C-alpha cells in the first residue's frame, strides 16, 4: 500500500492540505510568504503535489520546486527556518487529524528530504 493509501487517500490529503494552510496563515514565521498567493490555486496544487509525493500518482502536473520557490528565495529571504516551519506545520496538522505517529514519520521523511529542501531553497 502507498503512503497516500495508508493516510486515507484523496479525502485525507484534501483535508490535510486545507488544514495545513489554515495553520500556515496563522504562523507568524511564514504567513506573509502567501500575502499575494491565490490560495484556491495553491490548495489545488499542494493536493496534487502531495498525492504524487505520497505515491498516489506517477507525476506532479505543475512546477518544479526550485522554479516554484525561486522568487521567494531571491526577493523575500526564504531560508532554512521558514522551511522547518512549513515541515513542522504539516506534521502538526497530521497529528491533529489523528494520523498515527508511524505515518507522520513517513511524511516527515518526504518533507525533509535534501532533494526537496535544496530545490525549494534554491541551494
Ligand atoms: C516542502 C515540504 C514544500 C513543498 C512540497 C512545497 C510545495 C509547493 C507547491 C506544489 C507549490 C505550487 C507549485 C506550482 O506552481 O505548481 C508551492 C508554491 C509555493 N510555496 Fe511551497 N513547498 C514547500 C516548501 C515551501 C516553503 C518552506 C515555503 C515558504 C515558507 C513555501 C511557500 C510557497 C509559496 C509562497 C508558493 C506560491 C509561490 C508563488 O507563486 O508566489 N513552500 N509550494
Ligand atoms: C508551499 N506550500
Q: How far apart are CA 6 and CA 111, in angstroms?
A: 17
Domain, as residue range, for 83: 1-123
What dihedral do alpha carbons 71, 112, 34, 12 form, nearest 10°? 140
- Reading the block at residue 116, the C-alpha cell is 526537496
**CB 120, CB 67: distance < 8 Å:** no
C-alpha 91 chain-centroid distance: 10
- Reading the block at residue 73, the C-alpha cell is 528565495
Q: Choose which residue among 48, 68, 74, 91 to substitute to test ligand 1 binding: the one with the highest number of ligand atoms within 8 A of its C-beta.
A: 68
HSE toward the beta carbon, residue 61, CA cutoff 13 A: 5
Distances in whole angstroms, Cα of residue 65 to Cα of each of 13, 48, 77: 19, 13, 16
What technique determined this structure? X-ray
Which CATH number covers residue 27? Answer: 1.10.490.10
17: nearest Cα among 53, 48, 52: 48
Q: Whose CA is nearest to atom 7 of ligand 1?
A: 46
- The count of domains in the chain is 1
Please count the other Cβ atoms lying within 10 Å of the Cβ belonging to residue 95: 12
Q: What are phi and psi of 58, to 5 degrees?
A: -65, -40
Q: How far apart are CA 92 and CA 40, in angstroms?
A: 22
Amino acid at each position: 500500500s502507498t503512503l497516500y493509501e495508508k493516510l486515507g487517500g484523496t479525502t485525507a490529503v484534501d483535508l490535510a492540505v486545507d488544514k495545513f494552510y489554515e495553520r500556515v496563515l496563522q504562523d507568524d514565521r511564514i504567513k506573509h510568504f502567501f500575502a499575494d498567493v491565490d490560495m484556491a490555486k495553491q490548495r489545488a496544487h499542494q493536493k496534487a503535489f502531495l498525492t504524487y509525493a505520497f505515491g498516489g500518482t506517477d507525476k506532479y502536473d505543475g512546477r518544479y520546486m526550485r522554479e516554484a520557490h525561486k522568487e521567494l528565495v531571491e526577493n523575500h529571504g526564504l531560508n532554512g527556518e521558514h522551511f522547518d516551519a512549513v515541515a513542522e506545520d504539516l506534521l502538526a496538522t497530521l497529528k491533529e487529524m489523528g494520523v498515527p505517529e508511524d505515518l507522520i514519520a513517513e511524511v516527515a521523511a518526504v518533507a525533509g528530504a535534501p532533494a526537496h529542501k535544496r530545490d525549494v531553497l534554491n541551494q
